[PDB]
Design an enzyme around this catalytic site. Structure first.
Site, mmCIF file in Angstrom:
data_model
loop_
_atom_site.group_PDB
_atom_site.id
_atom_site.type_symbol
_atom_site.label_atom_id
_atom_site.label_comp_id
_atom_site.label_asym_id
_atom_site.label_seq_id
_atom_site.Cartn_x
_atom_site.Cartn_y
_atom_site.Cartn_z
ATOM 1 N N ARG A 75 16.920 -4.160 -0.396
ATOM 2 C CA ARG A 75 15.933 -4.232 0.642
ATOM 3 C C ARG A 75 16.140 -5.532 1.411
ATOM 4 O O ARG A 75 16.023 -6.623 0.859
ATOM 5 C CB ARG A 75 14.496 -4.117 0.058
ATOM 6 N N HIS A 119 9.530 -7.972 9.115
ATOM 7 C CA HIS A 119 9.078 -8.834 8.026
ATOM 8 C C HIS A 119 8.767 -10.209 8.649
ATOM 9 O O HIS A 119 9.263 -11.254 8.191
ATOM 10 C CB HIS A 119 10.165 -8.918 6.947
ATOM 11 N N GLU A 164 3.648 -5.863 4.714
ATOM 12 C CA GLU A 164 2.371 -6.493 4.490
ATOM 13 C C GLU A 164 1.579 -6.744 5.786
ATOM 14 O O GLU A 164 1.351 -7.897 6.137
ATOM 15 C CB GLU A 164 2.547 -7.776 3.672
ATOM 16 N N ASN A 287 3.805 -3.933 -2.933
ATOM 17 C CA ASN A 287 4.210 -5.216 -3.447
ATOM 18 C C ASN A 287 3.116 -5.662 -4.413
ATOM 19 O O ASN A 287 1.939 -5.473 -4.133
ATOM 20 C CB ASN A 287 4.356 -6.235 -2.299
ATOM 21 N N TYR A 289 2.143 -8.927 -7.419
ATOM 22 C CA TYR A 289 2.529 -10.207 -8.023
ATOM 23 C C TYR A 289 1.531 -10.699 -9.046
ATOM 24 O O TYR A 289 1.937 -11.289 -10.054
ATOM 25 C CB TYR A 289 2.680 -11.321 -6.960
ATOM 26 N N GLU A 343 8.425 -5.019 -3.946
ATOM 27 C CA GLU A 343 8.513 -6.421 -4.369
ATOM 28 C C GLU A 343 7.707 -6.642 -5.631
ATOM 29 O O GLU A 343 6.564 -6.191 -5.734
ATOM 30 C CB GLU A 343 7.952 -7.402 -3.317
HETATM 31 O O1 LIG Z 1 5.412 -15.053 -2.069
HETATM 32 C C1 LIG Z 1 6.638 -14.395 -2.402
HETATM 33 C C2 LIG Z 1 6.932 -13.235 -1.472
HETATM 34 C C3 LIG Z 1 7.362 -13.638 -0.066
HETATM 35 O O2 LIG Z 1 8.482 -14.544 -0.075
HETATM 36 C C4 LIG Z 1 7.640 -12.344 0.747
HETATM 37 O O3 LIG Z 1 8.174 -12.620 2.037
HETATM 38 C C5 LIG Z 1 6.386 -11.505 0.973
HETATM 39 O O4 LIG Z 1 6.722 -10.132 1.285
HETATM 40 C C6 LIG Z 1 5.465 -11.680 -0.191
HETATM 41 N N1 LIG Z 1 4.243 -11.141 -0.329
HETATM 42 C C7 LIG Z 1 3.698 -11.576 -1.485
HETATM 43 C C8 LIG Z 1 2.346 -11.217 -2.054
HETATM 44 N N2 LIG Z 1 1.274 -11.533 -1.107
HETATM 45 C C9 LIG Z 1 1.151 -12.738 -0.451
HETATM 46 C C10 LIG Z 1 0.374 -13.769 -0.998
HETATM 47 C C11 LIG Z 1 0.244 -15.001 -0.331
HETATM 48 C C12 LIG Z 1 0.888 -15.223 0.893
HETATM 49 C C13 LIG Z 1 1.663 -14.200 1.437
HETATM 50 C C14 LIG Z 1 1.797 -12.967 0.781
HETATM 51 C C15 LIG Z 1 4.623 -12.429 -2.069
HETATM 52 N N3 LIG Z 1 5.694 -12.453 -1.270
#
Ligand SMILES: OC[C@@H]1[C@@H](O)[C@H](O)[C@@H](O)c2nc(CNc3ccccc3)cn21
Length: 437
Positions: A75, A119, A164, A287, A289, A343
């Site tokens: 991706r 993105h 997102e 996504n 986390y 992700e």
């Molecule tokens: O934070 C790690 C990755 C980021 O590098 C990616 O570009 C993005 O798609 C991404 N989204 C999240 C989860 N949500 C989020 C939380 C705080 C700030 C921005 C996104 C994490 N991540």
């Protein structure tokens, strides 16, 4: 053992501005992340995407890493301003050539391209015309997407319109923490709405141009738990997770608690756009986390509560059952025909040992746990077709700059050397075996 379905797509994920560097090479236009990160005070340590992982030059090496790890899908995203330097009108053949080489290389090596159209690196030229705040972005985005479909749709068959859109609208236009750096709630909810209309116009154009591909959209999600014995959790799910967008897409309106909080902020006749927004999609990307303890708080009427739980270097609580929960919940609520985890990953404070290796057992533990829970969701009927680690490489982590490392490959920025971390070798074994043991 926990073996996955035949043909399950193990992937790694990146984004253009985070890895490429050379933002203005070969006729590219400025993006909003270029101008935002060159604005003092916006990004940790004054970090920018000027060099990043220098993937713009080292792309073949990086793909050779993907191949050698035996990872089946990649991706990556396309920089809109490399393709259309002013956002609409002129097409830059050199930008197209850059992604053509990546695409052709992946195919030759048997790796499946998953392309994120957007993105976060909007052309600066369009931001000057309001960007996501301007209804006309539905037209601009459709024209951009059409160019991509026409140039690459013969080879790329898996497409993601937006990464997102909640982050894009709210973090970019309400919190002001991401480009374009605004703090206006009415702008932020017009961006929500325009993101949907742009997504839907692009899907519509996809059906007219790429008779064989599949197209979807990616949402950020948290696992929210209530601090006691709840409606705050209901709100957070509907606002912060996939329902903000999937309720329009599948049901033709915003979720109920989103309207309670935000109706005054949406355009007055926003329902007029809903039938178009319902354009059929082929898959949902999720996504995931982190989990959050959440309570009602009178002083959006929600606050987070800190928990003594293992956290990553982001300070994000590690809650593996969240990825199972969100996969179950998406099937329960909207039943999309296919789901991907687009992700999942973790930031830890990685160090290259004297042995020349990066012993990121913390990241191995984090990945294993989540892969296990996605396995569970598959056993109970969720149509998960793939799973993508964020990220192949340590990279520019938006407003954190280079200080957060999410890769399964370590990048030494002083030399641009790539060192496969134990987690990358571990993951490769998982892909080879098609699951855990
Ligand atoms: O934070 C790690 C990755 C980021 O590098 C990616 O570009 C993005 O798609 C991404 N989204 C999240 C989860 N949500 C989020 C939380 C705080 C700030 C921005 C996104 C994490 N991540």
């Amino acid at each position: 053992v926990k073996k996955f379905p035949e043909g399950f797509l193990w992937g790694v994920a990146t984004a253009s501005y985070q890895i490429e560097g050379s933002p203005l090479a070969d006729g590219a236009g400025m993006s909003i992340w270029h101008t935002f990160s060159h604005t003092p005070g916006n990004v940790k340590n004054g970090d920018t995407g000027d060099v990043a992982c220098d993937h713009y030059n080292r792309w073949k090496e990086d793909i050779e890493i993907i191949e050698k790890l035996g990872v089946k899908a990649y991706r990556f995203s396309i920089s809109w301003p490399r393709i259309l330097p002013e956002g609409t009108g002129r097409v830059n053949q050199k930008g197209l050539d850059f992604y053509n080489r990546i695409i052709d290389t992946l195919l030759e090596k048997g790796i499946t391209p998953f392309v994120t159209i957007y993105h976060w690196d909007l052309p600066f030229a369009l931001q000057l015309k309001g960007g996501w705040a301007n209804r006309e972005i539905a037209d601009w985005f459709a024209e951009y997407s059409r160019v991509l479909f026409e140039n690459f749709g013969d080879r790329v068959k898996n497409w993601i319109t937006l990464n997102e859109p909640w982050v894009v609208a709210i973090v970019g236009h309400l919190y002001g923490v991401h480009a374009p750096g605004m703090r206006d709630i009415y702008v932020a909810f017009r961006a929500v709405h325009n993101l949907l209309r742009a997504h839907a116009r692009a899907v519509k154009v996809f059906r007219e141009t790429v008779k064989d591909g599949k197209i979807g959209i990616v949402f950020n999600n948290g696992y929210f738990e209530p601090a006691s014995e709840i409606r705050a959790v209901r709100f957070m799910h509907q606002f912060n997770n996939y329902p903000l967008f999937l309720n329009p897409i599948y049901r033709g309106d915003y979720p109920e608690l989103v309207l309670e909080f935000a109706r005054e902020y949406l355009p007055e006749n926003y329902k007029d756009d809903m039938s178009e927004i319902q354009e059929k999609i082929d898959f949902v990307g999720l996504n995931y986390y982190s989990g959050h303890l959440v309570k009602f708080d009178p002083d959006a009427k929600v606050s987070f509560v800190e928990r003594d739980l293992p956290k990553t270097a982001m300070g994000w609580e590690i809650v593996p059952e969240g990825i199972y929960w969100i996969l179950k919940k998406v099937k329960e609520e909207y039943n999309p025909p296919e789901v991907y985890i687009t992700e999942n990953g973790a930031a830890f404070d990685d160090v290259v040992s004297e042995d020349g290796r990066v012993h990121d057992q913390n990241r191995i533990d984090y990945l294993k746990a989540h892969i296990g829970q996605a396995w569970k969701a598959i056993q109970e009927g969720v149509p998960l077709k793939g799973y993508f680690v964020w990220s192949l490489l340590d990279n520019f982590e938006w407003a954190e700059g280079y200080s957060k490392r999410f890769g399964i490959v370590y990048v030494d920025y002083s030399t641009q050397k790539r060192i496969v971390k134990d987690s990358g070798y571990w993951y490769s074994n998982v892909v080879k075996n098609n699951g855990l043991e």
